[PDB]
């Protein structure tokens with residue numbers, strides 16, 4: 001189960017964050033890691049379509065090859081804090097698993113600037129028991145975390161050395177599909 005009420009960035013700029021571009025996960029901190037963690041690569045596009053906040057997600061496990069996409073509409077809880085019902089889709093946006101109650105994640109932007117962000121997510125999926133996940137994002141694939149986001153990690157009272165890097169994972173990303181999915 002999740003345990004954190006993440007605080008959103010003061011002065012969070014939603015239009016800048018939800019601009020249609022892609023964010024790559026470069027480092028992450030799972031507060032409830034599985035006994036045997038599946039080391040996934042992940043990226044998302046965040047945008048606005050017809051005035052609705054949307055995110056498209058991409059997960060890729062570079063060992064098993066497991067790959068999946070999702071699209072979500074985000075509902076506002078407060079500035080920088082959202083609740084997202086996800087639907088699993090193929091890369092083209094065709095629905096594989098429909099939206100359903102209890103399949104959602106919360107999403108809090110704790111820090112963001114033009115190139116980087118720190119987010120918290122809490123995933124709820126059926127009868128699974130999942131915990132908090134923090135992620136450092138960058139606009140550039142596998143970019144080393146800069147001082148601004150690392151300082152935000154500290155300011156959240158988290159230790160960056162505890163984060164797991166995805167940068168050495170042989171990750172590949174379908175960023176064109178993520179961008180196009182925002183309308184789906």
Ligand code: HEM
Nearest residue numbers: 025028038039040041042044070086087088105121123135
């Ligand atoms: C490197 C960072 C991440 C890792 C290692 C990771 C890992 C995983 C894993 C292992 C699952 C499968 C859960 C299961 O069904 O047992 C999953 C599902 C999911 N994750 Fe992540 N994740 C990451 C980042 C993110 C982010 C940043 C978000 C939200 C923005 C997110 C949202 C989701 C959603 C919505 C699902 C369920 C999708 C579906 O079933 O259709 N993940 N993730």
Ligand SMILES: [S]
Nearest residue numbers: 121123130133
């Ligand atoms: S996740």
